[PDB]
Amino acid sequence: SGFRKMAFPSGKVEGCMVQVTCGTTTLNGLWLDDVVYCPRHVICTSEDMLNPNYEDLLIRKSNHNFLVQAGNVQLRVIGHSMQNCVLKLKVDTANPKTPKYKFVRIQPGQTFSVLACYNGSPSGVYQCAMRPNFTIKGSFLNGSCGSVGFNIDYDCVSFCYMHHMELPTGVHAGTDLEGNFYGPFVDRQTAQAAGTDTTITVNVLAWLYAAVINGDRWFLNRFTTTLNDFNLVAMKYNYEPLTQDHVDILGPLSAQTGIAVLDMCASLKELLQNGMNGRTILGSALLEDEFTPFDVVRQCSGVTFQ
Amino acid sequence: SGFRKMAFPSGKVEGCMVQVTCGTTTLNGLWLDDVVYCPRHVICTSEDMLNPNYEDLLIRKSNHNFLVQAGNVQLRVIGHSMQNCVLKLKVDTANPKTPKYKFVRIQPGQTFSVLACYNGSPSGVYQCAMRPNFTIKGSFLNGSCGSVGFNIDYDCVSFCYMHHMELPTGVHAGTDLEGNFYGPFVDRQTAQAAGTDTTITVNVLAWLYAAVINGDRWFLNRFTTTLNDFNLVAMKYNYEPLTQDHVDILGPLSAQTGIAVLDMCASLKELLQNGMNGRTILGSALLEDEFTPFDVVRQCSGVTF
Ligand SMILES: O=C(CN1Cc2ccc(Cl)cc2[C@@]2(CCN(c3cncc4ccccc34)C2=O)C1)NCC1CC1
Ligand SMILES: O=C(CN1Cc2ccc(Cl)cc2[C@@]2(CCN(c3cncc4ccccc34)C2=O)C1)NCC1CC1
Ligand SMILES: [Cl-]
């Protein structure tokens, strides 16, 4: 029993974190085999950020301008290249702690663990979701750039995020491990703002199923809804539209509890209209949207507390 | 910017988790040097749990009755002993991944990271606090016994909890690594219940300071209070009494924000008597009490391990 915001064990990722320094700029790198991946803005000063010409800044650099430190050992850079917004530093030593891994680009609504790092040293691990506006609500200070997001389903680490910046509203933006930004952001200090964010409806529904599995049903009702009527109401509360794909993905949770997806949608409609009236759901007074259907199945018991 | 419920990196603990099997019971063990530590109830069947005589159950066991598996390697048990509610299995191989460590017993209000494990394999990591009633609000299924709680300071892992059982309300109970239970619990199948819990006041105050550090200031006011007048409010709302020690511990957070502790107490008093009026603090509609003053300082400074 219980339901917590749970991160993947971070050990496999901790063994990949290194410090990358270019001149006066220091940040984190990810060392997999003989390559260290890091944000390309490691080659920029604060003034370079207004309108950086990364190609012009990079051509002036040699391999020995990049200092890479793994623990208390200096790695030797023997090559460098830029791929989108990521710098790939070829080193002369393969990481002996390289886990089984993949680079995966995730969609909004998907969750992942973040290993926050400073100076190549891990400080903490927490769970995040890619928001519908492509930002993440992380906890990152200056020096955290290059910290990564990942999932570890079945002993293989799937790297999905690398940290690059904090937006004026205090939320965060970054790239996949190929250097492609999530959202319409650029690694430039120009006017950029997080678009209006919305609630991840399929995740709220998954978390309501989690509350039912753990033995709570106070929020259910005798009503049902059509998908379009549900969407017409939900969008009035800044909730993402629920698609037929989301209904399909909720199938196993619907089967385990015996509650049809559109019946749970009717409960969600009522909760949006009424609030919780002094009650909580899984120890929360707000509707939680950073647990996916897959996360609930992973954490919750396969047996419902009927 | 940002404020999240953050756990310590779990790598140093993952390298210590093993599977321990005794007959039909399978749970997790902690392998440090040549000893594997695990709940002593690994030697019990469901019927034994009704009224177990652990010394009598243990004397009937040989070293070869304990199957210890580290990854896909079988460890050989060469000795066994019991210390309080923990079983210590001497093995023929020292763990090459043993970190620098200490066994520490924590007080209620203190937080720690839990590395939830099943069959000796880590599944997840989350943060939690020892409640004033000595239970923890964890997330554990059958097979999670032997999973541990810990904190890190520099390179040293301080092991503070080992998981043993779930109570009827869905909360959890366990021991320190010397096998002493937190709370008035026993490792037996009998009627046991979590006592009435209270809110960790010093932690709520620390989290209000974290909200001010992050730009949330709507709840601040021109008022102050005495510690005596605040404690009368705390008792009325099921909050733990705030002591001069708690005020001293909040000193660095008070200095960073320029808000006196008793000044923050007057803000909490008004929140307790009026609610949030449709507002949130750090994305929460409830007053959060599972961040200590040290957790707030550590997260807002970037301490590494
Ligand atoms: O003070 C700056 C200037 N930043 C320009 C800029 C522009 C583009 C890119 Cl890709 C990167 C950056 C920087 C590189 C470091 N960085 C940070 C990343 N993660 C957490 C942070 C926490 C505090 C300060 C900085 C952080 C950036 O956003 C610095 N940004 C933050 C202001 C609130 C808005
Ligand atoms: O059905 C039982 C019988 N338990 C007796 C008992 C008595 C004393 C001790 Cl130390 C241990 C135990 C057991 C050993 C495993 N265990 C569990 C630990 N953590 C999460 C669990 C989740 C589900 C089931 C069991 C769990 C215990 O509490 C099993 N407990 C669950 C009922 C709510 C209360
Ligand atoms: Cl995805």
Swiss-Prot record, chain B:
There is a cross-link at K5, K90 (Glycyl lysine isopeptide (Lys-Gly) (interchain with G-Cter in ubiquitin)). It comes from the Viruses. Inhibited by pyridone-containing alpha-ketoamides compounds 13a and 13b. In turn, alpha-ketoamide 13b (tert-butyl (1-((S)-1-(((S)-4-(benzylamino)-3,4-dioxo-1-((S)-2-oxopyrrolidin-3-yl)butan-2-yl)amino)-3-cyclopropyl-1-oxopropan-2-yl)-2-oxo-1,2-dihydropyridin-3-yl)carbamate) inhibits SARS-CoV-2 replication in human lung cells. Inhibited ex vivo by michael acceptor inhibitor N3. Inhibited ex vivo by compound 11a and 11b. Changing Q189A: Does not affect ability to cleave and inactivate human TRMT1. It is found in: Host cytoplasm; Host Golgi apparatus; Host nucleus. The active site is at H41, C145. Residues 1-305 are cytoplasmic. It catalyses: TSAVLQ-|-SGFRK-NH2 and SGVTFQ-|-GKFKK the two peptides corresponding to the two self-cleavage sites of the SARS 3C-like proteinase are the two most reactive peptide substrates. The enzyme exhibits a strong preference for substrates containing Gln at P1 position and Leu at P2 position. Residues 1-305 form the Peptidase C30 domain. Changing N142A: Does not affect ability to cleave and inactivate human TRMT1. Cleaves the C-terminus of replicase polyprotein at 11 sites. Recognizes substrates containing the core sequence [ILMVF]-Q-|-[SGACN]. Cleaves and inactivates human TRMT1, preventing tRNA guanine(26)-dimethylation of tRNAs. May cleave human NLRP1 in lung epithelial cells, thereby activating the NLRP1 inflammasome pathway. May cleave human GSDMD, triggering alternative GSDME-mediated epithelial cell death upon activation of the NLRP1 inflammasome, which may enhance the release interleukins 1B, 6, 16 and 18. Also able to bind an ADP-ribose-1''-phosphate (ADRP). 3CL-PRO exists as monomer and homodimer. Only the homodimer shows catalytic activity. Interacts with host FBXO22; this interaction promotes the proteasomal degradation of nsp5. This is 3C-like proteinase nsp5. It comes from Severe acute respiratory syndrome coronavirus 2.
